[PDB]
Amino acid sequence: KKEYTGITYISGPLLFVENAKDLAYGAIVDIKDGTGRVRGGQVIEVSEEYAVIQVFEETTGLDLATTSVSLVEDVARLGVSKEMLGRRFNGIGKPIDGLPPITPEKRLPITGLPLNPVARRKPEQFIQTGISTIDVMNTLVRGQKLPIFSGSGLPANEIAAQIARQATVRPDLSGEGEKEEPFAVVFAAMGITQRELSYFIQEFERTGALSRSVLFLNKADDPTIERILTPRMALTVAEYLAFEHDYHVLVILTDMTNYCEALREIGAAREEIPGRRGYPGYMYTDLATIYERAGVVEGKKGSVTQIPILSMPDDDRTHPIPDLTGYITEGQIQLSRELHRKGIYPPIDPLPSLSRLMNNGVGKGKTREDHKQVSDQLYSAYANGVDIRKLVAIIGEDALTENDRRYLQFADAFERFFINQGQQNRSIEESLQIAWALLSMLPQGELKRISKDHIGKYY
């Protein structure tokens, strides 16, 4: 308030603070200086001697001499409001649009708690994306988490923001009134450059859909501390959507590489001994909790989708940061150079990629019947052809039988047109058709995974 002053020992980003008692672990406070500017610092480690507060920013200028610290509030957090729904905000939760703040309806503890198991209701629903391939072969089901493993320089972001706007759940195909349920895309990146920061806002505003989405985006340079809380924000805000009003959310976090890069620093200073290959011991846990914001919960009808997209450095699937995820998130959708070099877009491979849970997706009495078998068609068909494309280099083409010679050509039409999709949006129904057509190229009575009926109605 007025009060607690005579701060001794400040080295770099750490700070000890004289006798407080009031404080609590997980408190947050205003530091005030000799020039009126104010700074913030979280309450970590406290005793009967001192507490520990942590300069968020720079600390340029401070003094042994008095320059007090103001207790802000218990366990800080933020409220919410339906108002929020077309804004531009930074980290903590302040207006970056330039239009006055929110006005609550609630305050929300920002430790997100954990669910219960019984409460959760098994997924069974479907979601379109508007991208093709990631709906046809391996289909984002509803109330589902799933992540896009990118490479170092393959273009994640774009393949992000398309799948930002594009999606719209069609309940239509299942049967029920249309506007019984609306769609909320909740989006948060971080470690974004002045450059990146602009590619979003341009696309977002373009046709606009800001008016059905919430922003959160913690600049690159911005203090490393707030970074840590940043996602948890847009996660918890997501709750307030579906559980108190029903909605259908799509949360898309991004670049969780940053999430740990940034993480480490905190832990490295606040003390601990880092475990295996760095990445502070309690990662498993800490990472876990930023993914239990998902699934439908009986009775309640709305729910959360996670797609967090991140990049590896070692360009593997063995470095921990992604590997780890791959135990709790449930699938994998990679991007290869191969596609991308040849110039396609958005390059999402086939075969590396597969959503483990997707059976309770698409169905005969849920959203189109034949989809099942399309999915296991084009997959297994595909891989058969990608060998030939290499072995043709050793024996010429004068030694391919007829049936199989066609399985070469399949690949070309698949790769050139099918996984390319520029800016064209599509839909689950238009997409299944295309597929079919291409399959017609190879000889019939052979695609023996698929059942005869369907072929008798489509070709």
Partner: protein, 577 residues
């Protein structure tokens, strides 16, 4: 002001006592000599002195007196054609007072105090102004060297001395505010002077290395990174920019790079001509060099001054190209403090700050309109050095995924003999789509298509490479060995320039562009050669291949027609055979 003495001196760091009221990061003077200090930690009333130069020969109980300003280079007209120590001290004058030794106990001035200058004013007195509003234009070489309001000053004028020679120190503007503007103005380093606002970029930063201009390239606001082990050309690819970039100011600064590579640019650089005037090219040049050999802490100072210089010029209106030569040593330098002050570190012992002071740096600028309403660009292409070769190592990696435009410089490439060969199967730029407008119009209207087909072979070629090492080039037949060889030539001739061949070491687009169209053709017609019934085998051994060979060497003047001659030679030299 605030003063105490040495308590504990041992290593580049010291702990004084009897001190309070200090502020974080503050210049000071320690020892009878006076040396330049920094406040980096406090503990009751004792403070860790960080001591910028050397040490040795000290006793406990010697002066320790702060002034309480926290670092800053004093910026104003006349700075080019010089060299500058880590706290911007002109070594010329130093050399003139020492001999041939960088000696402690030195104080001079940043901008020389003698020279007076031809003034011109703009605004009339009795007028209003706000922050960073232009005031006077003192001319300076081929440049026009404006002067601004120092940011965050606003008020109303009251007199203006008219034209004539005038001192640097002089107050040549008075205000009704009791304030005084003089030529220069001091500005911190830890801060980051604003601008009017942030904006997207789209103008290519030309560079003339075909490899940096047809494949990977850079936006004007560009940020990139160049790494490669020892002996890899790391330095020399920044040499070229320093003498063939396309902008107002090269501000080459390297920290921890040897003399030899610096001094050289101080004896060659006088006798050359810029692509933007005709004058001694050295006008667009900074050099704040601070070679490895010097002190410890200076290595930390060094960079952030040349970042600031990078703002300072932008500010006036120009087009900054800053490049730090070998920023990685900086990490090592930072971490040498650490060790002595006992901060537990994160992996590979770097103190956890790698991100902290990295990430602020690289984000800095590009195409940002100023307070003056000019188009300001900050172009940085950061050099780094790993210490292994394992790009897995933290300080390296942290660069990626903080900046775009990554170039990697392969190691095993270079041992053979090319330069500035890079792996393009490592590399990747991001900036490459928002360059399309400018390219279309400026260069050719069909260029990006014609380039993607080059990458069409080039990145696909590995497709075969692997199979070569699995069963030889043997039993790879003919659409096979077509490609292999095409591409063979593609890197043998479209990817290797020099920095020492007398000519041919700089190109315009339109020239380069040319080379590149040929090869496509050659591919095309070859494709139709084998399909028709003959074979590459002899085609390789055609004389016309070698013409495509040597090709790059002729200069521009000839270039049109050179290129036209092969444009005839193709269609005849296929159909015939």
């Amino acid at each position: 002001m605030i003063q105490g003495v040495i308590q504990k001196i041992a290593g580049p760091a010291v702990i004084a006592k009897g001190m309070l009221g200090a502020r974080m990061y503050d210049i000071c003077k320690v020892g009878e000599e006076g040396l330049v200090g920094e406040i980096i930690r406090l503990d009751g009333d004792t403070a860790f002195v960080q001591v910028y130069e050397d040490t040795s020969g000290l006793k406990v109980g010697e002066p320790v007196v702060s002034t309480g300003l926290p670092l800053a280079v004093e910026l104003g007209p006349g700075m080019l054609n010089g060299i500058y120590d880590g706290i911007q001290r002109p070594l010329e004058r130093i050399r003139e007072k020492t001999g041939i030794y960088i000696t402690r106990g030195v104080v001079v001035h940043a901008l020389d105090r003698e020279k007076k200058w031809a003034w011109t004013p703009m605004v009339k007195p009795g007028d209003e102004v706000r922050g960073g509003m232009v005031l006077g234009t003192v001319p300076e070489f081929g440049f026009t060297h404006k002067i601004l309001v120092p940011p965050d000053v606003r008020g109303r004028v009251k007199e203006v001395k008219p034209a004539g020679e005038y001192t640097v120190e002089e107050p040549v503007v008075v205000l009704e505010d009791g304030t005084e503007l003089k030529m220069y103005h001091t500005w911190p380093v830890r801060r980051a002077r604003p601008v009017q606002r942030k904006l997207d970029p789209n103008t290519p930063f030309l560079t003339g290395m075909r490899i940096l201009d047809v494949l990977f390239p850079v936006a004007m606001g560009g940020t990139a990174a160049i790494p490669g082990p020892f002996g890899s050309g790391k330095t020399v690819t920044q040499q070229s920019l320093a003498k063939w970039s396309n902008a107002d100011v090269v501000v080459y600064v390297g920290c921890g790079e040897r003399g030899n590579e610096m001094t050289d640019v101080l004896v060659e650089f006088p006798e050359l001509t810029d692509p933007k005037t005709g004058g001694p090219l050295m006008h667009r040049t900074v050099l704040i060099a601070n070679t490895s050999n010097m002190p410890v802490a200076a290595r930390e100072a060094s960079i952030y001054v040349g970042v600031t210089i990078a703002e300072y010029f932008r500010d006036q209106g120009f087009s900054v190209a800053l490049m730090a030569d070998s920023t990685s040593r900086w990490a090592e330098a930072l971490r040498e403090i650490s060790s002595r002050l006992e901060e537990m570190p994160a992996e590979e012992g770097y103190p956890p700050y790698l991100a902290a002071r990295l990430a602020a740096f690289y984000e800095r600028a590009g195409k940002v309109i100023t307070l003056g309403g000019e188009e300001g660009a900050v172009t940085i292409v950061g050099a780094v050095s790993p210490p292994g070769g394992d790009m897995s190592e933290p300080v390296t990696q942290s660069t990626l995924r903080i900046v775009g435009a990554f170039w990697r410089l392969d190691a095993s490439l270079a041992f053979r003999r090319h330069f500035p060969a890079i792996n393009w199967n490592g590399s990747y730029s991001l900036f490459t789509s928002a360059l399309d407008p400018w390219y279309r119009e400026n260069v050719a209207e069909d260029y990006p298509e014609l380039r993607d087909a080059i990458s069409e072979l080039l990145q696909r070629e590995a497709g075969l490479q692997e199979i070569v090492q699995l069963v030889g080039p043997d039993a790879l037949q003919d659409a096979e060995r077509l490609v292999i060889e095409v591409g063979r030539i593609i890197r043998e001739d479209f990817l290797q320039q020099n920095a020492y061949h007398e000519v041919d070491a700089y190109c315009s687009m339109k020239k380069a562009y040319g080379i590149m169209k040929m090869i496509l053709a050659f591919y095309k017609e070859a494709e139709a050669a084998i399909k028709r019934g003959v074979s590459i085998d002899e085609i390789l051994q055609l004389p016309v291949l070698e013409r495509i060979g040597r090709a790059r060497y002729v200069s521009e003047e000839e270039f049109p027609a050179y290129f036209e001659e092969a444009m005839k030679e193709i269609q005849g030299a296929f159909k015939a055979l």
